[PDB]
Structure formats: structure tokens, C-alpha cells
């Protein structure tokens, strides 16, 4: 369950937050495939309750009402078409699995659902699954309010209701079997793995129970007994009863310590210096690399009050954002996930964005298609960070240096740093307020390389900065602190 | 419940020395550091010691301060030699896995999760 199952050589996945199935299918063929992306993490493909107040927030999709593959992203055959078309071009699909809960206990009764299924939250009624009141924990919780009141007690965070969400009784075989049925159908459709949403709120044992019921991957694209990729969402920044190391037995885990620590470093807050990133990795208190799923930001914390507060960098902070994403991508620690989001009107009142609920680009609830401009950027308010040359080329960079050891670290004692990945790639950063001028050993074979951050190798030419490494592997680097993108990168396949 | 109690501190003349101590009742297998907050100034990381023993040092203290741990008593240490009046500020002991924050004087310090009450140093 630890292996990503991506096509050999592909080392990252992108979160196409709220994209429609028809757009992802196309995106797979027109771009993800050609650009070496390993796979896509899609938003919950199961039916959820419809929220009109606020008007269709993104989070309504974390309130399941059934497991019918029917949502604002698309129907089941659209979903199927997408999995077939992405796999056929070497791009895996990973489903966001919301299995710890159904919708909010205080929702109205009726069919106000993405697929018209009926449900009565008040009575724990979900005929379309079907689930009854005895399929929920209600009695098992011991807090007075029935909700989570203290994260210092593992029992209530796993047996009580997260923000009113009807907590599913995952200890019951009936429940585990029903969830496995949903995930297995997905597997049979072609899905390569899952993100286990809100793992923190479930017992590791119940997870295991469900996981062990899962089928092997679809032999149409994978070899025989291939196990699905499992990466559990556990927000562990320390200071709590629950720790991520408790779920290592089920698969990998989201290391939120990563994005928090890196954001601070790159932002140069609290006296942090990039030169301190020499021992980046487990050394910094992080979980074991082969258990980590890393990212700079996620759909949740990029909205601020998530895991990491304002230290988390996002596309709003473009310049610095690209440097962090680039450092993570060049560095060997963990398995990387890049974020691809959508724009919305932020409105911070007393330190909190009260518009952070706003859902994906839409025309009266109907999600907008993702339009591609000739310059390869996206339209209709989709940010498409996964298409910024700076990030796109670094995903290629990671693919190219795969398996190569961290090497040739250099730093100017302040905020200028650089390192290599064996003899296949080198990267330099200038995060100081002054010019960077140095002759560094790149570990790369002599030659002329295209800087993949300022340009691209097209035909027999570079569109941007050219770096010349002499026979002895050294090269002169010059980056003004005022450069558009204060870091250069070159690799085996960017060599002219 | 973890509690980080810092010791040492006080006033001293320029060029003098001070040794700060931090006790913890949390073990010591993750990074522990020392931050300092001067009046009206941003919070700054002074020195950090990683599990393996390697350390980070603010360029302005490098060669003048020496961070260390004991393990045999769960105590971290920060020896401050050749003190300078610029070193005047409140020093906070900081430790733990993951990350946390310290909200002081309207400013927040992103760091190690657990902080100490802060000891006053004056040069
Ligand atoms: Ca639960
Ligand atoms: Cl996540």
C-alpha cells in the first residue's frame, strides 16, 4: 500500500481540486501525460448533500449521502471514461475517500442531494447505501455534546461527531463491508489508490479492516496482485494525543509538518534561513520518507486557517510559492503532490477569510469547463499551478533525477543555497536580498543546459537562461535577488 | 502535559557570559532551539540542535554561542560568550515535534510547538 503505483519514472500527483470528469480526461491526454505527471487526486466522486447556504461551498462534497458515483464533477460513465482515458496515457487516478462520516446530523430531510437520493440526517436514514441509525456511533461517544471537545483524548476524536458530521460506526463489519464495496467498485473501474479523508478521526484498526477487504488493481493497466496506493489524511503537527506513526501500518500519511516548516523557512519568518535546510527530511522531525506524502499546501490550508496558519505558501504568493514547490520537487524526501486550485474573492475579517467557503467556478451551481489559452494558462478562474513552467518543469525534474542521491550541497551562510541529485540534476536558489554569484560543482556531465525555470528546451534551443558546465562539472551561476524567479535548475534531459 | 522551564538569564556587562538552561517534563529526540525577542523587533531563531546533534546558528551569534543537550537529564543548554548589547532580549526555550507558534506583543513566532516562559537577558 506504500507504492504509488504510478507509471515507472513518474514521481508526482496533482490535486485537480473540483475539476469535472470531462475536463480531467482531456487534461490527462493533452497535458498530464506528455508532461510526466504520475496521476491525479480527484475530489470525492460519491454523491453528497447539497448546501445552498452558503451557496454550493466546496466543502459540501465532504458530506456523503450515498456512494452513487454522481456529483457536480460528473456521472458514473463520465467518471469511468475519465479513468480509462487517463490510465491509457499513463496517468493514474486517486480518489478522495470520505468514509469516516456521512452528512451533517443537522441537515434537512429530503432529496437535496447531488443525485436526488433521499436521506434523513436527523434519523440517520440513508436508504441509497443503505445505512440505518445502528450504523453510526451515537452511543459510543461519551462527551456531553456528542461532539469532539478535546483532541487530547483519542476516543472522542474517533467516536464523536466532527463538526456535527454523523460519525460512521466503522467497527461494524456491515459498515466496513459497505465502504469496501464502494472503494472496490472504484478499484475495478481503474482507480490506482485513495486518499483516506479524515483518517485522524478513525481507528487505525478499522482502516486496516476496510483496506484488507480491497481487491487487487485492474490488470488491464496494472500487473496482477498490485495493491492500491494508500495515503491517509492525518493532520499531525504535534501537540496532540494522536500521532501519524499510528497509521504507518495502513499506508503512507500526509506530512503536514512539511508544508508548515518550509513555508516559514522560505518566507524567512522567525529568523529561519534556507541554509538551515541542509538536513531537510527526517532530521527535521518528519516521519520516515517512505511513509510520507508531501505537499507545500493543500485545498484546506491554502485557505489560511488550516494546518500551518499563514506560514503556508500558496499561489497567492506566486514568486515565493514557486521556490518552495521547486525545493520540494528537487529534494528526495517523500512522495510529492502538487496543488492545482481555483481563484476566489478573499475577505479577511478579524484574521479569517469569510469567503473561504466559496466553491469552484460556476454558472448557477454548474461547474465551469477548464479553458486553455494559447500561452498554456487556464481560463474561467482555474489557476492551474500545475501548468506554470516553473512547477511543470520541476515535476519533470523529479522524474529525471529519480533514485539519485542528495549531493553537492552549497550555501552562502544565509539564504543562498544549492544541491544536486547524483549526476542527473542540479538546482540553485537565491533567497537573500542581494546578488548571487558563484561557481558551483553541479555533479553534472560537461555541457550546455537549459534553465528549466526561466525557459524550456525546444528543438535544439533554450528559450531562457543557458548554463554552461565545464568538463569538471562546475558552472558559473548569477541570480539577481530581483530576478523574476530567483532560482535556476538543470537536468540530464534539459541538456542541449 | 509538557512544561519547558528555562533558567539562567539576567544582566551582564559587554563581553561577559551567560548560560541558559531548559528543563522539560517531553523527552529529547527531536530538535530543540532557542529564540529571542527584542523589544519592538521580530522574533528571531538564535540556535537549534537536531536529534543527531547538528545545529543551526544565527550568523550574528555563530562562534559566540554554543547550544547543547544532555539527554541524561533532559536539559538543553545555550552558552553565550562575548555577549553584546545587541544580544539584549527575552530568550524563549522552544521544543517538540511538528510546529507551533508563540504570540507575544501582537507578533507570532512560528517554531517547535512548545515554548518556555522566556528569560530576560540584558547586556
Ligand atoms: Ca470517527
Ligand atoms: Cl490532504
Q: How was this structure determined?
A: X-ray
Between CA A2 and CA A322 the distance in angstroms is 28
Give residue A102 CA to ligand 1 midpoint distance, Å: 10
If you ran DSSP here, which 8-state letter would residue A99 be given? -
For residues A462 and B74, give the distance between their C-alpha atoms in angstroms, rounded to a whole number.
56
Please say whether the beta carbons of A206 and A227 come within 8 A: no
Task: Report the CATH number of the B1-123 domain.
Answer: 2.60.40.10
Which one of A239, A288, A417 makes the best mutation probe of the B interface by having the most chain B beta carbons within 10 Å?
A239
* CA–CA–CA angle A305, A317, B45 (5° rounding): 70
Domain residue spans in chain B? 1-123
Measured CB to CB, residues of chain A less than 8 Å from chain B are 236-239, 257, 260-261, 264, 269-273, 276, 279, 283-285, 308-309, 311, 413-414
Residue A99 CA to ligand 1 centre (angstroms): 9
How far is residue A14's CA from residue A31's CA, in Å, rounded to a whole number? 12
Cell of B28: 529529547
> What whole-number distance in Å separates Cα of residue A26 and Cα of residue A370?
10
Residue with cell 534531459: A493
- Any idea which fold A404-496 has? Immunoglobulin-like (2.60.40)
Which residue in A has a C-alpha nearest to residue B108's C-alpha?
A270
Q: Is the dihedral of CA A245, A250, A251, A255 positive or negative?
A: negative
**Cα distance between residue A105 and residue A50, in whole Å:** 14
Where along chain A do its domains lie? 1-403, 404-496
- Three-state secondary structure call for residue A378: strand
Beta strands in A247-404 (DSSP E): 252-254, 292-294, 335-340, 348-349, 352-353, 362-363, 366-367
Render A264-306 in DSSP notation, one character per residue: HHHHT-TT--GGGGGG-SGGGTPPPGGGEEE-S--TTGGGSSS
Spatial distance between the Cα atoms of A463 and A375, rounded to a whole number of angstroms = 14
Q: What are the residues facing A416 on neighbouring strands?
A: A430
B74, B23 contact by CB (below 8 A): yes
For chain B, give me the number of helices (H) and strands (E)? 0, 13
Region A1-403: CATH code: 3.20.20.80
Q: Which of A246, A257, A207, A263 is nearest to A230 (CA)?
A: A207
Contact A496, A460 (CB under 8 A): yes
Spatial distance between the Cα atoms of B61 and B89, rounded to a whole number of angstroms: 14
Q: Which residue matches cell numbers 529525471?
A: A400
CA A334/CA A312 separation, integer angstroms: 18
Amino acid at each position: 500500500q506504500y507504492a504509488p503505483q504510478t507509471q515507472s519514472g513518474r514521481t508526482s500527483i496533482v490535486h485537480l481540486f473540483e475539476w469535472r470528469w470531462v475536463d480531467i480526461a482531456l487534461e490527462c491526454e493533452r497535458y498530464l501525460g506528455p508532461k510526466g505527471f504520475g496521476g491525479v487526486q480527484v475530489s470525492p466522486p460519491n454523491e453528497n448533500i447539497v448546501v445552498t447556504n452558503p451557496s454550493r461551498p466546496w466543502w459540501e462534497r465532504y458530506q456523503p449521502v450515498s456512494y452513487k458515483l454522481c456529483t457536480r464533477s460528473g456521472n458514473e460513465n463520465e467518471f469511468r471514461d475519465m479513468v480509462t482515458r487517463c490510465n491509457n496515457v499513463g496517468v493514474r487516478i486517486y480518489v478522495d475517500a470520505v468514509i469516516n462520516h456521512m452528512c451533517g446530523s443537522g441537515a434537512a430531510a429530503g432529496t437535496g442531494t447531488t443525485c436526488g437520493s433521499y436521506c434523513n440526517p436527523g434519523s440517520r436514514e440513508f436508504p441509497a447505501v443503505p445505512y440505518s441509525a445502528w450504523d453510526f456511533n451515537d452511543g459510543k461517544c461519551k462527551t456531553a455534546s456528542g461532539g469532539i471537545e478535546s483532541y487530547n483524548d483519542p476516543y472522542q476524536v474517533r467516536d464523536c461527531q466532527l463538526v456535527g458530521l454523523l460519525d460512521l460506526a466503522l467497527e461494524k463489519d456491515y459498515v466496513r463491508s459497505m465502504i469496501a464495496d464502494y472503494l472496490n467498485k472504484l478499484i475495478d473501474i481503474g482507480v490506482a489508490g485513495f486518499r483516506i479523508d479524515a483518517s485522524k478521526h478513525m481507528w487505525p484498526g478499522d482502516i486496516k479492516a476496510v483496506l484488507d477487504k480491497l481487491h487487487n488493481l485492474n490488470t488491464n493497466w496494472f500487473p496482477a496482485g498490485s495493491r492500491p496506493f494508500i495515503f491517509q489524511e492525518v493532520i499531525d503537527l504535534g501537540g496532540e494525543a494522536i500521532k501519524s506513526s499510528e497509521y504507518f501500518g495502513n499506508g503512507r500519511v500526509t506530512e503536514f509538518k512539511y508544508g508548515a516548516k518550509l513555508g516559514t523557512v522560505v518566507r524567512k519568518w522567525s529568523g529561519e534561513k534556507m541554509s538551515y535546510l541542509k538536513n531537510w527530511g527526517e532530521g527535521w522531525g518528519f516521519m520516515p520518507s517512505d511513509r510520507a506524502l508531501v505537499f507545500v499546501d493543500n485545498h484546506d490550508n491554502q485557505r489560511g486557517h488550516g494546518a500551518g496558519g499563514s506560514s503556508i505558501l500558496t499561489f497567492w504568493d506566486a514568486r515565493l510559492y514557486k521556490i518552495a514547490v521547486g525545493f520540494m520537487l528537487a529534494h528526495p524526501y517523500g512522495f510529492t503532490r502538487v496543488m492545482s486550485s481555483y481563484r476566489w474573492a478573499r475577505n479577511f475579517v478579524n484574521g479569517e477569510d469569510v469567503n473561504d467557503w466559496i466553491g469552484p467556478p460556476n454558472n448557477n451551481g454548474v461547474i465551469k469547463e477548464v479553458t486553455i489559452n494559447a500561452d498554456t494558462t487556464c481560463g474561467n478562474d482555474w489557476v492551474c499551478e500545475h501548468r506554470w513552467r516553473e512547477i511543470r518543469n520541476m515535476v519533470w525534474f523529479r522524474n529525471v533525477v529519480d533514485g539519485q542521491p542528495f549531493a553537492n550541497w552549497w550555501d552562502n551562510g544565509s539564504n543562498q543555497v544549492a544541491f544536486g541529485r547524483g549526476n542527473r540534476g542540479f538546482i540553485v536558489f537565491n533567497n537573500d536580498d542581494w546578488q548571487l554569484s558563484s561557481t558551483l560543482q553541479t555533479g553534472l556531465p560537461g555541457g550546455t543546459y537549459c534553465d528549466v525555470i526561466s525557459g524550456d528546451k525546444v528543438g535544439n534551443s533554450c528559450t531562457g537562461i543557458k548554463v554552461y558546465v565545464s568538463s569538471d562539472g562546475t558552472a558559473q551561476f548569477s541570480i539577481s535577488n530581483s530576478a523574476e524567479d530567483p532560482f535556476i535548475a538543470i537536468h540530464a534531459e534539459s541538456k542541449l | 502535559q509538557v512544561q519547558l522551564v528555562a533558567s539562567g538569564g539576567g544582566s551582564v556587562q559587554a563581553g561577559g557570559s551567560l548560560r541558559l538552561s531548559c528543563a522539560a517534563s517531553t523527552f529529547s529526540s527531536y530538535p530543540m532551539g532557542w529564540y529571542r525577542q527584542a523589544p519592538g523587533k521580530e522574533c528571531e531563531l538564535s540556535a537549534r540542535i537536531f536529534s543527531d546533534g547538528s545545529a543551526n546558528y544565527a550568523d550574528s551569534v555563530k562562534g559566540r554561542f554554543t547550544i547543547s543537550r544532555d539527554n541524561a537529564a533532559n536539559t538543553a543548554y545555550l552558552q553565550m560568550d562575548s555577549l553584546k548589547p545587541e544580544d539584549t532580549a527575552v530568550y524563549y526555550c522552544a521544543a517538540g515535534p511538528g510546529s507551533g507558534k508563540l504570540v507575544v506583543a501582537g507578533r507570532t513566532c512560528y517554531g517547535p510547538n512548545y515554548w518556555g516562559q522566556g528569560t530576560q537577558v540584558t547586556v
